Amino acid sequence: KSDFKFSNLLGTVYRQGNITFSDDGKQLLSPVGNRVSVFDLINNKSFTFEYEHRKNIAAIDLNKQGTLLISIDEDGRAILVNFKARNVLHHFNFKEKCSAVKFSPDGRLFALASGRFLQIWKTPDVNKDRQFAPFVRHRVHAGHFQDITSLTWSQDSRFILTTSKDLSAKIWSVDSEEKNLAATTFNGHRDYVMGAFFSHDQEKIYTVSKDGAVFVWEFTKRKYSWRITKKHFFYANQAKVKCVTFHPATRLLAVGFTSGEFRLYDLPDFTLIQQLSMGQNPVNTVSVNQTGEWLAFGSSKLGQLLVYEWQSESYILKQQGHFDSTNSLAYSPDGSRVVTASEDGKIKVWDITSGFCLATFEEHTSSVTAVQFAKRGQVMFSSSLDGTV
């Protein structure tokens, strides 16, 4: 009757940082202002973790199997979370601003893009107890000139390449005896190489830059090493990339442009599937599953999230919250319903367990201020600075 603990945060569906699905396509990880929300798509439920971060989140990933969650601030506060258990395991402090954490497909070790540094650490063990210093830095690769903006493993754990705002996109292995097998760098672009990738076969390399360019690197002849076999330009005129992902097993590029446009390609062919205007507002993050049939966008101009299929023209959720504009809140007589009003006018209807705006009403033109329920939770009203109730 006294003890109230934090259960769940609702809405403000994207502010800052990386978006990811889990191993399964059920669990979607999004950052909130300082927390991580998980939205389960088929089993339609929502969740936000019991803890909060100290600054805004700028980097996020979860484990291979869904055991460990790494959230990293703008500054580099790193929080190890038992993802299945929703309890915090470790607060590490990375002293640089990092942009990408990616676990191994092995799950054995993760890596981090901080500055011109790549830091490759072993995973802490989940079934093991929590230790003082769980983290063991395996290696540190500092062969880059400017801040490293994107990063990926291979589908094998034995190959990791990172890309910077410096022109370079550089591969190494985990282990140094696998250095001599492939350790080289890629250059020859124009701009910020914003995403470089392995294909699903580990022989083709895709490198994508901010200017609108892709190179198809391949270990081929004129010993002999690593030529461009082709380039690919979407020819975005003044618009340029913000975010790019590549689903390898179906050979699919998701692009995010500065103009809010987004493209899909088939990368040995480079063929435009469809162009969607996500809006005026740019895609700040793209994401695919391992199945690669859902896509996830976030506009940090508005604060919206969007799960949409590439193959079928069909969304999953088009959620658009409003920061600083959560004016009213209303419990129904039923304990299953919640009403949130706004200054933008949207009045949403939530379930407490399944945190979804089941309904909205976008019919007020101005701020909606006060909302009360009456008659067993049937009717629900909305007084406004829109001049009405």
């Binding site: 009757k1 003890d3 109230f4 603990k5 934090f6 259960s7 769940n8 945060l9 609702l10 809405g11 403000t12 909130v32 202002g33 300082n34 927390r35 019991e50 909060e52 971060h53 100290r54 600054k55 805004n56 055991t67 299945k84 258990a85 929703r86 309890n87 989940v126 079934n127 705002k165 910020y192 500065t258 740019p282 919250g321 920061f323 600083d324 959560t326 004016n327 009213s328 809140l329 209303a330 419990y331 007589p333 304990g335 919640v338 949130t340 009003a341 200054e343 939530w350 407490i352």
Partner: protein, 102 residues
């Protein structure tokens, strides 16, 4: 409600290493150094308090909680904050707990 440095009225005591000679260390306009033109563009009208958009306060967002209600049943209270709707409850042990993991 929220423990965030970028939220403005969170901290009780400010860190004196950020109080420089003339000014805060954070009150300097750092939007002018972004790589992108759009993030370098400033549209902030000066004295906007809880106005339209986030970028136009020319400030950090204040930590404020507008609306407060109880659940009837399980005494759970929800408050729509600046961050969003928060839920406190007495529905304890809904924290999901896997047992004997391989």
């Amino acid at each position: 409600v929220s423990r965030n440095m970028a939220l403005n009225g969170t901290l009780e005591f400010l860190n004196s290493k950020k109080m420089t000679e003339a000014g805060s260390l954070d009150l300097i306009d750092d939007a002018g150094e972004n790589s992108d033109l759009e993030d370098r563009i400033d549209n902030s009208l000066p004295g906007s308090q809880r106005g339209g958009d986030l970028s136009t306060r020319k400030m950090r967002p204040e930590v404020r909680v507008t609306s407060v209600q109880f659940s009837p049943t399980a005494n759970a209270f929800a408050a729509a904050s600046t961050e969003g709707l928060l839920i406190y409850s007495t529905n304890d042990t809904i924290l999901f707990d896997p047992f004997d993991l391989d």
